[PDB]
PDB file of C-alpha atoms and ligand atoms in Angstrom:
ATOM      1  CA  UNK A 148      36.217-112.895  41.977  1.00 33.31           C
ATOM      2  CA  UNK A 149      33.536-113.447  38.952  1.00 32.23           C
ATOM      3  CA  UNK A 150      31.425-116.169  39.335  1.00 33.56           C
ATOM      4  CA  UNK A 151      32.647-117.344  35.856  1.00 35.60           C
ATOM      5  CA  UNK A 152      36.695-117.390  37.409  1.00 36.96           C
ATOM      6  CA  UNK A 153      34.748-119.039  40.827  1.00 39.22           C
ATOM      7  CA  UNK A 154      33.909-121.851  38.933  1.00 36.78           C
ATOM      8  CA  UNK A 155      36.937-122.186  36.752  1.00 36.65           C
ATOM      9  CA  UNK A 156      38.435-122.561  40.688  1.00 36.65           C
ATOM     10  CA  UNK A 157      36.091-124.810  42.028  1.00 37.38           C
ATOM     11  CA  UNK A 158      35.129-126.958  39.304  1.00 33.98           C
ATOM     12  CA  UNK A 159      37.385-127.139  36.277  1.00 31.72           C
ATOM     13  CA  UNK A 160      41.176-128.810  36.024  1.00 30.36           C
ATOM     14  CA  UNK A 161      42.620-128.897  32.720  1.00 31.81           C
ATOM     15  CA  UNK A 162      46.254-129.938  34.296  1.00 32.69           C
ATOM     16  CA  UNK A 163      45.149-133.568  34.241  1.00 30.64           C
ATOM     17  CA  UNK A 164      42.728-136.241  31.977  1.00 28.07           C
ATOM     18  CA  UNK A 165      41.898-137.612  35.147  1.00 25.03           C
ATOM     19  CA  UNK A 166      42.585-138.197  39.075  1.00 24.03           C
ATOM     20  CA  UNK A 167      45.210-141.678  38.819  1.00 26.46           C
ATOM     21  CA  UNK A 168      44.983-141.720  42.701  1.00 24.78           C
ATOM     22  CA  UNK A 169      42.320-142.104  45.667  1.00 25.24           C
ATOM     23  CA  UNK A 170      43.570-139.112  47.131  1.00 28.19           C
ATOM     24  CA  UNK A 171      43.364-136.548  43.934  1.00 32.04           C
ATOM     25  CA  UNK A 172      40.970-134.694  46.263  1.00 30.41           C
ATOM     26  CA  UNK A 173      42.295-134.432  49.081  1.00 30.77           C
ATOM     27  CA  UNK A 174      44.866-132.404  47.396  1.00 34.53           C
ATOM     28  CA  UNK A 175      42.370-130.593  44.948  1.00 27.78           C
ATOM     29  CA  UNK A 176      40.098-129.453  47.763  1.00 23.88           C
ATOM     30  CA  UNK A 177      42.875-128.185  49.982  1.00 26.81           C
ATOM     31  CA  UNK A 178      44.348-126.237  46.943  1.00 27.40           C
ATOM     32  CA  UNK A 179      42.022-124.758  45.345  1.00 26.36           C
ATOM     33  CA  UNK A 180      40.456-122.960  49.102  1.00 22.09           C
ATOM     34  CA  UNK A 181      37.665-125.449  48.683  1.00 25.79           C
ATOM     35  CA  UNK A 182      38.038-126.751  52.650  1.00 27.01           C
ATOM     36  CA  UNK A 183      38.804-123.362  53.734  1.00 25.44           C
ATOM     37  CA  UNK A 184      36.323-122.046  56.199  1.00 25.51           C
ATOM     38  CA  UNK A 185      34.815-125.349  56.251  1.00 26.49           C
ATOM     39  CA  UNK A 186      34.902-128.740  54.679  1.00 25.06           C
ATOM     40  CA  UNK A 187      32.971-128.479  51.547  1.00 25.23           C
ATOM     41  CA  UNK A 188      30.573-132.089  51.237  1.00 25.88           C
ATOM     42  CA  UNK A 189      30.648-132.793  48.129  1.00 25.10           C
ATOM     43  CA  UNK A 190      32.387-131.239  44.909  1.00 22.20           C
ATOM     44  CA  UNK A 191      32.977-132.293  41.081  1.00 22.21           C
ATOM     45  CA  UNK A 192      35.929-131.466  39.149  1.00 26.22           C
ATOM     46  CA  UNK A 193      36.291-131.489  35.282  1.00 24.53           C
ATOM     47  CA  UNK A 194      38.875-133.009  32.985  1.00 25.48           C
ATOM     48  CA  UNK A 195      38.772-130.942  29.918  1.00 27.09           C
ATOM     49  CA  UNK A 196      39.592-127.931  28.066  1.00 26.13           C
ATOM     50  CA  UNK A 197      38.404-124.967  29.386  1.00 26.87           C
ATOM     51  CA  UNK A 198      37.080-124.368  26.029  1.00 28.61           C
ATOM     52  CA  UNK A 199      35.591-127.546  25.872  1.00 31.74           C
ATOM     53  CA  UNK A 200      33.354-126.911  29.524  1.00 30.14           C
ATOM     54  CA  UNK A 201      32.316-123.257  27.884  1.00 32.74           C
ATOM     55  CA  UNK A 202      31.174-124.724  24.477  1.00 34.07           C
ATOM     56  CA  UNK A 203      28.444-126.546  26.666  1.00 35.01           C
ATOM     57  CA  UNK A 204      26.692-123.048  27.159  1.00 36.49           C
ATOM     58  CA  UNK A 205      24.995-123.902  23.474  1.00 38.66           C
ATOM     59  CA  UNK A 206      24.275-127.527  23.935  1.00 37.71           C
ATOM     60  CA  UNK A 207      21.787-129.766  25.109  1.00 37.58           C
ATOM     61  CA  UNK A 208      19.363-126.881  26.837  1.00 38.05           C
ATOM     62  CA  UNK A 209      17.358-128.789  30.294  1.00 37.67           C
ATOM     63  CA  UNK A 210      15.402-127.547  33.071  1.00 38.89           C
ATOM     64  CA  UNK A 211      17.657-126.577  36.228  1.00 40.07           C
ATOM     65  CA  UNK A 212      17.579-127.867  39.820  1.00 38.11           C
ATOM     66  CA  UNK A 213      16.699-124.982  40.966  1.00 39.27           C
ATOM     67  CA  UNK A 214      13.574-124.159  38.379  1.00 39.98           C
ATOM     68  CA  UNK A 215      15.462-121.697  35.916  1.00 43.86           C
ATOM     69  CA  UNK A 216      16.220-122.919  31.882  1.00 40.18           C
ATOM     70  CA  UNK A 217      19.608-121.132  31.778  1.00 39.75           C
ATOM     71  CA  UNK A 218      20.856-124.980  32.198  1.00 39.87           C
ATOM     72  CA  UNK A 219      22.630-127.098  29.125  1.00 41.78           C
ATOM     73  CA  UNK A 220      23.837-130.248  28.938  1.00 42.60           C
ATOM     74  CA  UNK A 221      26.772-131.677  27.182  1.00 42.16           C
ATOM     75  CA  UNK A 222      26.189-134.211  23.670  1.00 44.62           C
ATOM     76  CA  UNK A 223      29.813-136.038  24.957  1.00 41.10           C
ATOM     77  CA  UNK A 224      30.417-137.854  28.148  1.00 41.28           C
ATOM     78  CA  UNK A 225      33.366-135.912  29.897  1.00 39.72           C
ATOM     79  CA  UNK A 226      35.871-136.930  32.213  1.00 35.46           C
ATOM     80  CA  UNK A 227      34.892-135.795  35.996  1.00 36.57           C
ATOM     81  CA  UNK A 228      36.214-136.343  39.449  1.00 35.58           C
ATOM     82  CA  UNK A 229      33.681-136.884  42.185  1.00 34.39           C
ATOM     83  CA  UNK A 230      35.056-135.376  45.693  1.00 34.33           C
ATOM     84  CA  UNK A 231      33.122-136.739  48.754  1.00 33.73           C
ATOM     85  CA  UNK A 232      33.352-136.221  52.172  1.00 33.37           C
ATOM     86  CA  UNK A 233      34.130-139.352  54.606  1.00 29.97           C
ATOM     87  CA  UNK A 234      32.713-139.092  57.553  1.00 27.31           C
ATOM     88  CA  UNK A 235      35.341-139.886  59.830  1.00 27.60           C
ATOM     89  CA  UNK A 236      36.614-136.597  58.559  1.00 28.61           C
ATOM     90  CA  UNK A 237      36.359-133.440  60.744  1.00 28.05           C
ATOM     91  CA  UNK A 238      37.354-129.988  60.480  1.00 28.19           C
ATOM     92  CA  UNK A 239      40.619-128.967  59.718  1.00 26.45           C
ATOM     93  CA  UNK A 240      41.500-132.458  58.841  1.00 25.82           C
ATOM     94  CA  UNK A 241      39.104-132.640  55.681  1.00 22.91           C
ATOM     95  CA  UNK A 242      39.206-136.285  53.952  1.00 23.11           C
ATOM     96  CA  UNK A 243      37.581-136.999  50.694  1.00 20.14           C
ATOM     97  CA  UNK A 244      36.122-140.079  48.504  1.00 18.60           C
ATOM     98  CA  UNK A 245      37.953-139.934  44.982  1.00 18.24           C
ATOM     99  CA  UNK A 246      35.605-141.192  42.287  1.00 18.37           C
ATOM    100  CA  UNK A 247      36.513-141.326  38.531  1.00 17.27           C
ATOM    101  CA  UNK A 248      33.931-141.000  35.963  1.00 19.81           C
ATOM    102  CA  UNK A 249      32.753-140.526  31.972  1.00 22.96           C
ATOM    103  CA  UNK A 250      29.536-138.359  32.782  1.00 23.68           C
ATOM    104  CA  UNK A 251      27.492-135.949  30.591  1.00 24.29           C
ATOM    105  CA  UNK A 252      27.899-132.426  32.376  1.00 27.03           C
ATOM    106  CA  UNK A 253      25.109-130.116  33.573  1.00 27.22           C
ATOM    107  CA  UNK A 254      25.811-126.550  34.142  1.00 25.39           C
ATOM    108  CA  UNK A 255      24.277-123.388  34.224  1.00 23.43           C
ATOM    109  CA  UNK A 256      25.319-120.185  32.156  1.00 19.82           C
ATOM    110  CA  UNK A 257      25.170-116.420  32.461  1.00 13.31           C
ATOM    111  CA  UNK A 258      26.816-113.270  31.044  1.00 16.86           C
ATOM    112  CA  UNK A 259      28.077-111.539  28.192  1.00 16.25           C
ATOM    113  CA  UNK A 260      29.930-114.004  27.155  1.00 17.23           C
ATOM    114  CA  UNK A 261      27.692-116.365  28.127  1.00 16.84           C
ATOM    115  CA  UNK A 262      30.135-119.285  30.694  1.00 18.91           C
ATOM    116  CA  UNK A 263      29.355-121.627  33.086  1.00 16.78           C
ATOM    117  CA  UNK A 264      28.463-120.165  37.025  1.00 15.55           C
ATOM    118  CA  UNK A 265      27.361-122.839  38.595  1.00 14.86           C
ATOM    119  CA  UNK A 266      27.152-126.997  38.006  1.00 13.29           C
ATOM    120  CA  UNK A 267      24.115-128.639  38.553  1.00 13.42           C
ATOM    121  CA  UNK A 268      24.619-132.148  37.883  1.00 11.10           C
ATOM    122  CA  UNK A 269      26.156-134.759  35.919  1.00  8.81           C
ATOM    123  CA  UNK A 270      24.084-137.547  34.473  1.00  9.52           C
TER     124      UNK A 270
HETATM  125  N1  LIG B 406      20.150-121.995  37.144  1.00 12.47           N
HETATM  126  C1  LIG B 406      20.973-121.812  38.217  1.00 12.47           C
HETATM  127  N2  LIG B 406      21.018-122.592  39.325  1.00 12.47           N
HETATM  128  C2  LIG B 406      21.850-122.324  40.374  1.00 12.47           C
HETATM  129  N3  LIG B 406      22.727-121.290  40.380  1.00 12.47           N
HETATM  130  C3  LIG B 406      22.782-120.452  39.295  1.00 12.47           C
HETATM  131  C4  LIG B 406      21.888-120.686  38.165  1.00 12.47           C
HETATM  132  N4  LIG B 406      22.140-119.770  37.224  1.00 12.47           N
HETATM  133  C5  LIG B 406      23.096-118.965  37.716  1.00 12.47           C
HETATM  134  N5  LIG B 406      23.487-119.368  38.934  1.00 12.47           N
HETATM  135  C6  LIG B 406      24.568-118.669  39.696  1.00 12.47           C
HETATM  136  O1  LIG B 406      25.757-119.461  39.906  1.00 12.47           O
HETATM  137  C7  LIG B 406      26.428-118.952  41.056  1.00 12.47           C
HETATM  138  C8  LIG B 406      27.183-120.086  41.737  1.00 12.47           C
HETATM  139  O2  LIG B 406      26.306-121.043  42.331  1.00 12.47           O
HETATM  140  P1  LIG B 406      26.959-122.150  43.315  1.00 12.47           P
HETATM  141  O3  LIG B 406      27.804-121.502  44.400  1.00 12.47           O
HETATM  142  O4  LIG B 406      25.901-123.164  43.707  1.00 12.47           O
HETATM  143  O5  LIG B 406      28.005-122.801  42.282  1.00 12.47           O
HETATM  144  P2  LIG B 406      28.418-124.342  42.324  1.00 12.47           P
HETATM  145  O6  LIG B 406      29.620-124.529  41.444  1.00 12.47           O
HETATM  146  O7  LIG B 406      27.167-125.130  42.059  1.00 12.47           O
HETATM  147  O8  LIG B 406      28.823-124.564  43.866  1.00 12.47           O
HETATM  148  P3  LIG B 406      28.716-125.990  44.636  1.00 12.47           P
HETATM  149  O9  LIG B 406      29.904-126.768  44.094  1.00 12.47           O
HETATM  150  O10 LIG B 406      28.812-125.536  46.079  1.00 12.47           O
HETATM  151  O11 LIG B 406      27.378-126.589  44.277  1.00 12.47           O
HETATM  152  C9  LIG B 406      25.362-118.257  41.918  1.00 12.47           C
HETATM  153  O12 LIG B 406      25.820-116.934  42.244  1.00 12.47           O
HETATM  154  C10 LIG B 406      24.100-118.201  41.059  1.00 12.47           C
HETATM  155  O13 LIG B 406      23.634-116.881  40.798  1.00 12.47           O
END
């Protein structure tokens, strides 16, 4: 699996402008092997073309978490889906927070073509 498809799986959803329930992740996370060997804390999903996500990769360009410049933010808000753990959930049973938002994205990029690996934050 390329980390480019990895985060098509664990970040993006075109299928959908937005989560209309609280329990969008609970079904997400499940489905997409996200609470698999574990329950994943926290995880945010994307509500826009694919092409739309990749385009960021020549935006906005911002320092990373993590201390590298290979980050870029989006001009446009975006739709996103927050997934949080509850704490009254435990392992296999895996419960999650839904929360809807209009965010700018934050994601890192690598390759040739250059796509998005990893999401850093959303502001
Ligand atoms: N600037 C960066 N910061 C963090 N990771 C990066 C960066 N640039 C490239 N990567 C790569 O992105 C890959 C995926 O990172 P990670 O698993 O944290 O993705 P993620 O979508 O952020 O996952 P999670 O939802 O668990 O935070 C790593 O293999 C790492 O090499």
């Amino acid at each position: 699996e390329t980390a480019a498809a990895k985060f098509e799986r664990q970040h993006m959803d075109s299928s959908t402008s937005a989560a209309s329930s609280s329990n969008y992740c609970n079904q997400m996370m499940k489905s997409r092997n996200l609470t698999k060997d574990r329950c994943k804390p926290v995880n945010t999903f994307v509500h826009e073309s694919l092409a739309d996500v990749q385009a960021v990769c020549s935006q906005k360009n911002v320092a990373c978490k993590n201390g590298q410049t290979n980050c870029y933010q989006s001009y446009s808000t975006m739709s996103i889906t927050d997934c949080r753990e509850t704490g009254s959930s435990k392992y296999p049973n895996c419960a999650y927070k839904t929360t809807q938002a209009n965010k700018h994205i934050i994601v890192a990029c690598e390759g040739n073509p250059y796509v998005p690996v990893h999401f850093d934050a959303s502001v």
